[PDB]
Amino acid sequence: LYFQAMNIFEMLRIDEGLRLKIYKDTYYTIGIGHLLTKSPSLNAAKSELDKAIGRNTNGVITKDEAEKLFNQDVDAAVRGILRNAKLKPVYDSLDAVRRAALINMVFQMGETGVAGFTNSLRMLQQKRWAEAAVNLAKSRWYNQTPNRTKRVITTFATGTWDAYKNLRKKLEQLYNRYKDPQDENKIGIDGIQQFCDDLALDPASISVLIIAWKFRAATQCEFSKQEFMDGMTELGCDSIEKLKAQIPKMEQELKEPGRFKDFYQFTFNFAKNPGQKGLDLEMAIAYWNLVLNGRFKFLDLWNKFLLEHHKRSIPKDTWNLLLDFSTMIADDMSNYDEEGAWPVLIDDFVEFARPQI
Ligand SMILES: CCC(=O)N[C@@H](Cc1nc2ccc(C(C)C)cc2s1)C(=O)N[C@H](CNC(=O)/C=C/CN1CCOCC1)C1CCCCC1
């Protein structure tokens, strides 16, 4: 296998993204789109992953492990392309860099999807790079993934890694403005403040929390280099101005209850201290005031109730269920099911609140 792929791993890590934990596909997946099983059983998915890696991974792997899986998929993709009468001649005719761009297309839309680009593939085989680049930009492929597609088209247009090299340069330069002087691998207190200042936003604002959700950031007041790099690339941003222009789209998403529920539950995980399973009361109240503002009629009475009668940590299930409570609760609380499976804390709140109407 060693006689037969160095830049291809980084090309698809940028275009498709690298996931280190087993995730749900629109199917059990890990790494750069590696399929584990067609089964709906996670036990089966973990078994396949454990067999493929050679250890009890419990659904979590390293980047080197993700690379080993990726190299297997590249090889399988190459075998498939060569068995395809519509793709083999174009693949054979192409140089190493342009083959990597064709494998990228196969990874995205499969062989049948790629074979559909008959006019474009002909131009590539004919080495009419300018004509092929213009033609590929006309497709729906270009609108569905404009950032990824432009990068792949550039690879076919130039036969170089310039689209990937230049994105990484732009992000690396931008990163240097925010990196911690005491730790190059992260953005510190100062850096996060600067990032927020550059976006003309307060670091405790709802907009910054929406950005944190979109970046899948782990913890408040922390921001790793990997979080910044992956977040900026997944969002198709290479500057603060581009990220700033993405905020209204992120805001519109939250008007749909499914997205709002995902963001609301993410807030708990983001707000909590690493090493703690619960969220401290003062912190829970501060984030509730931000995310439940204009969504929960009883928010202030809830805060007063907790500060005087609970005075303890908030578990994840209670945090999650509070959104369901806020949605269903009547203004007079007359519809509250005192025997309807709510946490005891919410039964206690309704008992405390009801005399005050
Ligand atoms: C709402 C967004 C939100 O979580 N902001 C973080 C700050 C941010 N975190 C990230 C992380 C990542 C990224 C990326 C996505 C760009 C942006 C940011 S900006 C906040 O102010 N957290 C406080 C809580 N925590 C603190 O007050 C911690 C203070 C630190 N110590 C040590 C230094 O001296 C002071 C004490 C709350 C925010 C809500 C209102 C109450 C305070």
Question: 10 Å Cβ neighbour count for 249?
Answer: 10
Rounded Cα distance between 118 and 139, Å, is 12
The preferred substitution site among 214, 221, 230 for testing ligand 1, maximizing ligand atoms within 8 Å of CB, is: 221
The preferred substitution site among 171, 194, 195, 208 for testing ligand 1, maximizing ligand atoms within 8 Å of CB, is: 208
Ligand 1 centroid – CA 255 distance (Å): 24
Six-digit token string for 304:
């007063």
Identify residue 258 by its one-letter amino acid code: G
Q: Which residues touch 190 (CB under 8 Å, ≥6 apart)?
A: 180
SS (H, E, C) the chain: CCCCCCHHHHHHHHHCCCEEEEEECCCEEEECCEEEECCCCHHHHHHHHHHHHCCCCCCECCHHHHHHHHHHHHHHHHHHHHHCCCCHHHHHHCCHHHHHHHHHHHHHHHHHHHHCCHHHHHHHHCCCHHHHHHHHCCCCHHHHCHHHHHHHHHHHHHCCCHHHHHHHHHHHHHHHCCEECCEEEEECHHHHHHHHHHCCCCCCCHHHHHHHHHCCCCCCCCEEHHHHHHHHHHCCCCCHHHHHCCHHHHHHHCCCHHHHHHHHHHHHHHHCCCCCCCECHHHHHHHHHHHCCCCCCCHHHHHHHHHHHHCCCECHHHHHHHHHHHHHCCCCCCCCCCCCCCCHHHHHHHHHHHHHC
Ligand 1 centroid – CA 204 distance (Å): 6
Rounded Cα distance between 229 and 25, Å, is 22
Rounded Cα distance between 293 and 210, Å, is 14
Catalytic residue among 15, 16, 65, 238: 16
The two beta strands, 19-24 and 34-37, are: unpaired
Ligand 1 centroid – CA 270 distance (Å): 10
Rounded Cα distance between 152 and 277, Å, is 43
Q: Which of 132, 111, 109, 131 is nearest to 121 (CA)?
A: 132
- Nearest CA residue ID for atom 21, ligand 1: 204
The two beta strands, 34-37 and 179-180, are: unpaired
Ligand 1 atom nearest the C-alpha of 215 is 15
- Nearest CA residue ID for atom 38, ligand 1: 204
Rounded Cα distance between 36 and 48, Å, is 6
Ligand 1 centroid – CA 203 distance (Å): 6
What residues does ligand 1 touch, defined as CB less than 6 Å away?
Answer: 189, 192, 195-196, 203-204, 208-209, 211-212, 215, 217, 220-223, 286-287, 290
Ligand 1 atom nearest the C-alpha of 221 is 9
Rounded Cα distance between 348 and 306, Å, is 10
Catalytic residue among 25, 75, 184, 337: 25
Rounded Cα distance between 349 and 286, Å, is 18
Resolution of the determined structure in angstroms stands at 2.1
Six-digit token string for 265:
């539950």
First to last CA, the chain: 74
Ligand 1 centroid – CA 197 distance (Å): 14
Ligand 1 centroid – CA 334 distance (Å): 38
Ligand 1 atom nearest the C-alpha of 219 is 11
Question: 25 catalytic, yes or no?
Answer: yes
By the 8 A CB rule, do 69 and 49 touch? no
Ligand 1 centroid – CA 92 distance (Å): 53
Ligand 1 atom nearest the C-alpha of 214 is 15
Rounded Cα distance between 267 and 278, Å, is 12
By the 8 A CB rule, do 169 and 16 touch? no
Rounded Cα distance between 121 and 119, Å, is 6
Q: Which of 269, 263, 301 is nearest to 284 (CA)?
A: 269
Distances (CA, A) of 349 to 178, 294, 304, 324, 336: 44, 19, 10, 15, 11
Question: 280 catalytic, yes or no?
Answer: no
Rounded Cα distance between 234 and 119, Å, is 30
Question: 10 Å Cβ neighbour count for 131?
Answer: 15
Q: What is the total residue count of the chain?
A: 357
Ligand 1 atom nearest the C-alpha of 287 is 39
Which residues on neighbouring strands pair with residue 279, listed in sequence order?
314
